[PDB]
């Protein structure tokens, strides 16, 4: 059989949301992607031996509110909380994303994965300890990734699917 999962990729401008998504769906790195393009993307993969259809919303745009975001916040089953390891404010922003997702779900138990992207870059400003401890406090996995090299990209998305599977079992 197969299973479909509705995923949402959130995080500050420029953390690599589109780059991660495109690495997953097209298997290569894109340097330039219009920051105003918010859209969902479908992709069939195989995760732990089961065919998995991913429906991924790559959040974007300058708008405070988006009908598409609203829809996926309601129906999305899992959320990728992305920050760039060289941008401290993007890490500080993670709290605000998690808080909003929890409120719309009216639940403290929403499948999420914390993603520290741009792990290839030398000049990091967010310590791995901070991120590990944050994820620890949230009770969620932390995966380090690089959309550029593709390091950890499948792990981030597949880990999120595994978290969804656990949540559906409850
Ligand atoms: C460069 C473009 C890009 O990739 N961007 C800009 C954004 C778009 C989504 N962003 C965002 N979104 C929210 N809230 C969303 C609300 C919504 O659309 N509901 C239907 C829901 C999220 C996506 C789960 N919030 C923020 C945000 C970030 C940091 C601080 C705040 N403040 C905190 C203080 O109180 C006011 C909100 C909000 N950003 C950015 C991704
Ligand atoms: N070095 C490096 N650059 C990245 C990585 N991921 C994204 N970028 C770059 O960061 C910028 C923003 O990426 P983008 O996918 O547009 O971020 P978004 O605004 O969160 O969708 C682009 O110039 C990308 O090429 C990464 O893992 N490593
Ligand atoms: Ca984007």
From Swiss-Prot:
Modified residues (N6-acetyllysine): 105
Gene Ontology CC terms: cytoplasm; cytoplasmic side of plasma membrane; cytosol; endoplasmic reticulum membrane; focal adhesion; Golgi membrane; membrane; mitochondrial outer membrane
Post-translational modification summary for this protein: Acetylation at Lys-105 prevents interaction with guanine nucleotide exchange factors (GEFs).
Membrane association type: Lipid-anchor
GO molecular function: G protein activity; GDP binding; GMP binding; GTP binding; GTPase activity; identical protein binding; LRR domain binding; protein-containing complex binding
InterPro entries reported for this sequence: P-loop_NTPase (IPR027417), Small_GTP-bd (IPR005225), Small_GTPase (IPR001806), Small_GTPase_Ras-type (IPR020849)
Protein name: GTPase KRas
The gene coding this protein: KRAS
């Amino acid at each position: 059989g197969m299973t479909e999962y509705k995923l949402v990729v959130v995080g500050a401008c420029g953390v690599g949301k589109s780059a991660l998504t495109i690495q997953l769906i097209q298997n290569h790195f894109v340097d330039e992607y219009d920051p105003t393009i918010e859209d969902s993307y479908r992709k069939q993969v195989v995760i732990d031996g089961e065919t998995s259809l991913l429906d991924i919303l790559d959040t974007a745009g300058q708008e405070e509110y988006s009908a598409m975001r609203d829809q996926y916040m309601r129906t999305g089953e899992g959320f990728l909380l992305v920050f760039a390891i060289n941008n401290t404010k993007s890490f500080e922003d993670i709290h605000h994303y998690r808080e909003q997702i929890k409120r719309v779900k009216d639940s403290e138990d929403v499948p999420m994965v914390l993603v520290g992207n741009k792990s290839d870059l030398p000049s990091r400003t967010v310590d791995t300890k901070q991120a590990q401890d944050l994820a620890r406090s949230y009770g969620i996995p932390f995966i380090e990734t690089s959309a550029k090299t593709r390091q950890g990209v499948d792990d981030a998305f597949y880990t999120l699917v595994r978290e969804i599977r656990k949540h559906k079992e409850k």
